[PDB]
Design a protein around this ligand. Structure first.
Ligand SMILES: [Zn+2]
Ligand SMILES: [Zn+2]
Ligand SMILES: [Zn+2]
Lengths: 116, 76, 76
C-alpha cells in the first residue's frame, strides 16, 4: 500500500539527516558545527571529534604537526583540526537522495528531501 | 498533516502541521508542547537546516517526516 | 583564535586570528599593531617561510602557536 512508500521515504530522509548530525556519544544530543575547529564541546561537558565522531579528551586527538599547504601530514594519519567535512557530507547526502529517487521511480512507476 | 520532531535528547513528539506553515509557526508549536523558546530551536530535515521565513513545503517536508532539534556549536 | 608572533629582539606580539585568515591578513594585523608594512615582513614557522596567499590552516598552524617575524628593508 501507500504505507510502504512512506516507510521508504522517511528512512532515506533519516539517513540524509544522520550524515549531517553528530550525536554525542555521552549524552546523545544532536550537534552541528557552525565554524571553527573539529574539536567539539557538547553541553554535557564531553568533547568529540566532528570528523570521526569519536569521544576525545582534548587537542591531542588531532594532527598537530606542521604541514605544507595542499599536502597531507607526513608524520601521522590523525584527524585534521581544520578540514571542513561539509562538502564531503553534502556529496554523500546527494548521492543517497539521487539513488533513492531512482529506486522509488523503479518501484512506483518523486523527490525525497529538500531540493538542490 | 502529522510530522515528528526529535528533541535534543532523542525524545520524539508529534505535531499537526500544514506544508504551507512557516518555520516560525512550527517552532511556536514546539514551544506549546515542550516549552522550548523558539530562539533556542535549530531544526534539521533530511540533512538541511530550516530557516526562518521559509515554509515546510520549501524543504519537501511531507507526512510522517521527522524534524530534528540540534545544537549549533563553534569548534575550538 | 590567538597566536603569538615573536621577533628576533625577543618581543612577543599577541594576535587574534581565524584559521581561514591568510598570511597576508596576518601581516596586515601586524602592521596594525606595530606599524610594520607587510613588504618588510617575513613570517617563518617550523622553518617554512609562510606565503601570503595561504591560510593559517594550510600550514596546520595551531591555537597558541608561535610564528617568527624576520624583517627586511628594500627601500633602504
Ligand atoms: Zn553530550
Ligand atoms: Zn577524529
Ligand atoms: Zn600529523
Amino acid at each position: 500500500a501507500e504505507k510502504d512508500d512512506i516507510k521508504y521515504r522517511t528512512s532515506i530522509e533519516e539517513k540524509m539527516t544522520a550524515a549531517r548530525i553528530r550525536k554525542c556519544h555521552k549524552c546523545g544530543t544532536g550537534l552541528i558545527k557552525s565554524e571553527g575547529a573539529n574539536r567539539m564541546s557538547c553541553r554535557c561537558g564531553a568533547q568529540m571529534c566532528y570528523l570521526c565522531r569519536v569521544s576525545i579528551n582534548g587537542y591531542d586527538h588531532f594532527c598537530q604537526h606542521p604541514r605544507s599547504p595542499g599536502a597531507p601530514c607526513q608524520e601521522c594519519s590523525r584527524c585534521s583540526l581544520w578540514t571542513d567535512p561539509t562538502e564531503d557530507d553534502e556529496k554523500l547526502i546527494e548521492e543517497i537522495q539521487k539513488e533513492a529517487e531512482e529506486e522509488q521511480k523503479r518501484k512506483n512507476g518523486k523527490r525525497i528531501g529538500p531540493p538542490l | 498533516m502529522q510530522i515528528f520532531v526529535k528533541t535534543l535528547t532523542g525524545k520524539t513528539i508529534t505535531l499537526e502541521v500544514e506544508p504551507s506553515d512557516t518555520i516560525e509557526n512550527v517552532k511556536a508549536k514546539i514551544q506549546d508542547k515542550e516549552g522550548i523558546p523558539p530562539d533556542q530551536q535549530r531544526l534539521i530535515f533530511a540533512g538541511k537546516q530550516l530557516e526562518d521565513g521559509r515554509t515546510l513545503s520549501d524543504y519537501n517536508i511531507q507526512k510522517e517526516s521527522t524534524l530534528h532539534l540540534v545544537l549549533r556549536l563553534r569548534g575550538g
